[PDB]
Amino acid sequence: MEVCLPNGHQIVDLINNAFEGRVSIYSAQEGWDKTISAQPDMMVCGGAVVCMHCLGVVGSLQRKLKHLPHHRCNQQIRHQDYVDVQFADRVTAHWKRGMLSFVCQMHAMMNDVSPEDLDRVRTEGGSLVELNWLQVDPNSMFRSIHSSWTDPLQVVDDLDTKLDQYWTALNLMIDSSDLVPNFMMRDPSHAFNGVRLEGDARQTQFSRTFDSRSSLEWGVMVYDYSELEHDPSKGRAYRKELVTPARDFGHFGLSHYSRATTPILGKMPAVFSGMLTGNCKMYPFIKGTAKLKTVRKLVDSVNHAWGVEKIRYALGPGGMTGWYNRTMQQAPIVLTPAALTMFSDTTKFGDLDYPVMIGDPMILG
Amino acid sequence: MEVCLPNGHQIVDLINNAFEGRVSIYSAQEGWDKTISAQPDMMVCGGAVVCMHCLGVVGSLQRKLKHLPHHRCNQQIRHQDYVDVQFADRVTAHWKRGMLSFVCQMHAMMNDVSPEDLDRVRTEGGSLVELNWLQVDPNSMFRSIHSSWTDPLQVVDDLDTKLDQYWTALNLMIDSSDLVPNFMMRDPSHAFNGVRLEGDARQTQFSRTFDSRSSLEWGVMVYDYSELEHDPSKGRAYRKELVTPARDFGHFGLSHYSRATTPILGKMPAVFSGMLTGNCKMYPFIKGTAKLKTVRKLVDSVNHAWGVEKIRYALGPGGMTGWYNRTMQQAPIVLTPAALTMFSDTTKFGDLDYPVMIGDPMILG
Amino acid sequence: MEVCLPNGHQIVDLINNAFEGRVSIYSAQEGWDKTISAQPDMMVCGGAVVCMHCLGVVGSLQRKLKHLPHHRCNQQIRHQDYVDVQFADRVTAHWKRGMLSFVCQMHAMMNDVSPEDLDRVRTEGGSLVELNWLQVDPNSMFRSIHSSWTDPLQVVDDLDTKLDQYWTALNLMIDSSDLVPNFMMRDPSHAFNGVRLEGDARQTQFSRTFDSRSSLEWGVMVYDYSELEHDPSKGRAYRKELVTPARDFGHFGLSHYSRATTPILGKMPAVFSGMLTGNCKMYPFIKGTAKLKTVRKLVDSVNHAWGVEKIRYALGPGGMTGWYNRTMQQAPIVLTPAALTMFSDTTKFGDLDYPVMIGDPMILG
Amino acid sequence: EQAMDLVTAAEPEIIASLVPVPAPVFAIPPKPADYNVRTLKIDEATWLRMIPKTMGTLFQIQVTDNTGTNWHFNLRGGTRVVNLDQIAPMRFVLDLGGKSYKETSWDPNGKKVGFIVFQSKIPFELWTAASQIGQATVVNYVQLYAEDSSFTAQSIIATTSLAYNYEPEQLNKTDPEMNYYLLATFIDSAAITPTNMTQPDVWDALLTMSPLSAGEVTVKGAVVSEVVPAELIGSYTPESLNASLPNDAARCMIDRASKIAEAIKIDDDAGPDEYSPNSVPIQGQLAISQLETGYGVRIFNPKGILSKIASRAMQAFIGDPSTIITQAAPVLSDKNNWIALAQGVKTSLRTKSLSAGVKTAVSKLSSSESIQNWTQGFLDKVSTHFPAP
Amino acid sequence: EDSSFTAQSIIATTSLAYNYEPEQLNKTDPEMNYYLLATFIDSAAITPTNMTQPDVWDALLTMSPLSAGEVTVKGAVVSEVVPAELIGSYTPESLNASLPNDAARCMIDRASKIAEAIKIDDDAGPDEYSPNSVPIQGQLAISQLE
Amino acid sequence: EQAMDLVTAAEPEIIASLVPVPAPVFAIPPKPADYNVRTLKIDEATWLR
């Protein structure tokens, strides 16, 4: 069976889905399911299904096929070159699960708080509640030495709807309280470089990407406001005027701006879309340029794998090497999520006032 | 000269225009003027000229016709098939003349009120003027058993402009003085199903349709506020807060919403288009199912008189019968005017407070 | 080398540019530089390159040509037929040079007041800056008998840019100082027909045209507002109530209205487009029909000299004569700047109370 | 004979080539097309070039033309320009009517806008300073007046056609570093304040482009100097075909296919889903495919079922020959099958020796006979009017 | 994206394509009804407040027939048609609403070929009689006499 | 001769046929059309629900 190599738009789509975790992959062991790890057989890129072994587009969304009958497949592809796509997808799924679980734990503590206690806190200020990070979700594959990326993914359903409802509710409650969470950051770039890092924070090293090469295991990290709470010469009113996230990210009710949290999971920051957008979308703070670098070696192997004339027809003029160079030029534009730049433009208060340390999360009035 | 049937869209439009009573009919004695009754020789359907004796479109509105040329006419068309439609159109025209004469009388009476009297009533409230309903358009068949649709049509010139101006002046005067008429209704449903009837008024029957069988002669039914005058709780201030229509319909000069009267004539309340729509238009609130059934006899005669392929192409799927079934499915949409849906949804005062009976028209404060 | 005739629309564009003194003209001795007067060899008209000796258009700017290409030249084209056009463009250019020098002078004078004196004048109104009208561009043809249209053009750079900057600064300064000028008129029509002239103003004769039949040398016309300062009832508060230009022209920073001075040069007021619209544009108050009438002699010459078929194709219906008549009918449509109608409708101080005389421009509150 | 003339025009072996073909023989005249640069999507198309957003570079520049008029204008951030370098000769006509383009003190109506071409070694995207634009020149400019539009309270710019014809010789490019760009923006001799006008370009306007060259084609996702028809066969997705410009070889292949489609239609008048001589090559191709060992999934399909599928495929081709260029077209997946059928179809036309269908003619004769009867009756009525003595 | 006109947003070009095969449906049950919709699609039920459009049918659509065996007459697909009945049977509105597979359009193409053939055969100007026009004059005279 | 070939290709009997003509016999290759479903009139289209 003659097969077609992928076009550039489909490959960009494949990369986005992999970071997205929305990629459609068919494996004989799991069929179209990707819940349990297996070597990839069929994947969907740019509206089309591709055979991993022959590196050719096996199918399109137009038709439905239970399985592939024997067909021409080169099978000369090295899994090492394309192992990264599968790894990225698995990492993304597990990480998204971890962020949601951490969110559930904090929101649950807030729901448990009795309303009278919250009003008393409003009267006196200070952190409403805290949770022990050292004891927080060690069960996670990132947080378990025994747990592995290869380990089968937990079955997850309805995650997006629950995430959206809980985040909005938590934000609205926090807005009424005017308490300050110490688990969020005005600027994400400050977390990789900006906020002072000391001890374990000094020990912290940021690869700035989810990759096989860099360990993703790291502790929960929070802004240091315990000192201000102890030195209450600073006012709860002063904090609401400035320390409040609305003071830095804009009024949540009145703002479409995204808000940045601390990199609690393996030093991984989370992006939450502004309330005015009307939905909650979660993204780790990782550059798309890294994804482009991930495909460069694969690009060289494919260039050797497929004929130049076929490439000229499929990718059009300039070749796949030219396509990649143009892509290196577009690394800032084609793979960039809008929400990452959607945050409040600037912060008058500044962050140098308070350092970030690995600490139990809390919100303080 | 052989002739062919008009298109289904043209026919549906023709039915809507006919219900508007803007039917264009040609008779040899009166030519295209329908003021004097005569058997129709030709009728205009959707900008097209149809022979009334062979039922064949013979031309279009672009070409004026002064005489009917000798032609190969099937001459199988019975006048009785569409004479009832002619009767309905003539009766509608008589009804429009009655509405116009009634408007002229009310406007003149309102104009006569002296400003000193108006101010004294503004100080006190209560009906400014009362008209004996027995004196309202008695000559018409609507108040005379002797009068018939077969009687000659009253000559009317510039009816629309005069009606719009009078209704507008009346509404502006009522709005400036915050007056309350006993001949207006917030919602159409109570008119045939809602307002409480007294004595013989309970036996009054609203057909909700147009038929020759129902006598069109009846008394004028209106809201009863004699008990309202007796009632201590609803004073001029109470009325200004709720009873005056502007509280429920909005200010006449500031609203697009339509205003409707009690079924003063033909057992039919009248709907006037909102002032901000750019004109005031009065229409009866009637369903079109009857119009569709009235074409049923025409469909059977045509099915006998026309070719299968021609009918399938012109009337669409199901031939004429299929077109009728589909149109019956579309009657809620194709035959229901938006103007029927242009009234304010919100009515604070409510329409079930006082009973409706055949009574003297009046405007009160 | 044969040559082709131009279109009437191209001609209208050429006429507008000629009245704007911005026509692109090429001479063999001076090339494309028109600084030195010479018989034109080529002109750019309505998107076309026209031969000034054979009336031929066969070239475009997209491909540059070092010189007029060797061509078959009719030499039947009389300079006297189009010399007036060259005269108008050159005179307008000299006039622009004079206007610019005058603006620079006013700007410098406006910048010559001590702030304490400036504040005292702002508080009490009265003269703050006055320019000696004799000092305004004395060497120009409009102020010196010696200057002629044939004379070489004064070398100038960024004339439009300098005029715009000075006008903007001057308008902002007057707006801050709330000065009322004796050198501005709300309505141009009064200038030739309305304002009562005094002395030499009575002798002033307005050609209302650009032709070599009228002296263009004249004194600077200004309002005799000396009696206005004399008037007691017109106190600084009273003037701000009605006299201030902000009352008549509006705020320069806050108004879209155009601003016109008195006929300072060549008995011609300068009118600048509203700043809020985007920019200030100054044009002399000239009727388009007169410019077309000047073209009338050349039109007759062309009609005699060119082939009927060629004339019909280039000048359109009615030949050149028909095009001219139709153009005369449409002269308001295509020959009128909108800014003329962009002046403020409301005028409190007015232009007819006081007489106009050749005097020193001044602004006072 | 008309069918044989169609085959002669087709030259199918050339139009079914899978090996290198001389570009001129395949190439045919290009067709002008209209696009809006604001509507243009640069990422999907390899050809489209635009300065990337986020560069945010605005700088005012002034240059004089051959006439010598000096114009002041500023390039601004997010501005896109036609990449003139490598596109060969082109003539462009622009209509900006209906774009509000209103400045606070500047009225768009009566303003002049111009087309500017810059020639320089630095990439226009890589341009960060005024010196980078290099040989930037406004080829043409238009001053126009606008009036109120149909939209309530909305004015509409009058219909316009700013047009310029540009060819490679005028640039005379001798240096690869030198890059040529085309931009649509308001141009004036006087300096214009950037703050008042925020538009990156007037490229958000109706634009008409006429190609002066048809030598550029992209296949396999790659620009190609010479084109292989087999590579062209089934190589463009609908969105990808939309991305492909009129100069793309696929459109030429489709026109050659339309002549071939006409020949196939003359060859076969059989009803849909009915086995025919035309599909015999098709059934054979599928049979060879059925013979082919199936990579991965392998299945066997009945020859009669194969005939039904082939009939459906053939009817689909009759409905749309241009579908052949669709990339990996499931319906049009085999290029060799198309090539073989093309040779077979030419042969069937050549092999054809006076074969025709009787039924349509007999039905026409029957209608003609009834018309003859009608004519006789009319003549009879005429004789009633004008009887033979 | 945002257009050159300020306050105007521009959607990027799309090529959403749906192939409708009735045979792929293989409709057997007449009760079974087939409906086509085009709208933004999400895996999770959408909050009704967020998106209020009934559908995204307010879009420019390019249609390509997947059937070559069906022609439409009087609102219906037809296995056969009467050309004489076809003559002069469409209002401009009906023809404009007709689908690309309409018989009227095919009839018009055939008619244009015939008109071109008649014009090649007859070089007579308007108001000039010819052997191919006088029969029409005779038909009109016979029609008036009839 | 060319005019006669054109007339034969047109098929006068088919164009002027007064009797039923099979759809395959009458029809000729169709062309694509574009529409905006939101702007379509239900009183014109019987192909929409």
Numbering used by the authors:
A (entry chain G), B (entry chain I), C (entry chain H): 1 to 365
D (entry chain K): 287 to 675
E (entry chain F): 433 to 578
F (entry chain F): 287 to 335
From the study:
The particles harbour 10-separate genome segments and comprise two principle protein layers, the innermost composed of 120 copies of protein λ1 clamped together by 150 copies of σ2 (viral polymerases, λ3, are attached inside adjacent to the icosahedral fivefold axes).
In addition virion-like particles of two types, ‘empty’ and ‘full’, were observed. Thus purified virus particles provide a good model for the in-cell empty virion-like particle indicating that the internal RNA does not alter the fundamental organisation of the structure, thus at the fivefold axis on the exterior of the particle, there is evidence for the σ1 spike being attached. Although there is essentially no RNA in these empty particles there is evidence that the λ3 polymerase is attached at the expected position to the interior of λ1 close to the fivefold axis. However there is no evidence for the lattice-work organisation of the N-terminal 181 residues of λ1 B subunits on the inside of the particle which has been assumed to play a role in organising their assembly around the threefold axes, indeed there is no evidence for ordered structure for the first 259 residues of the B subunit (in the A subunit there is density for residue 241 onwards).
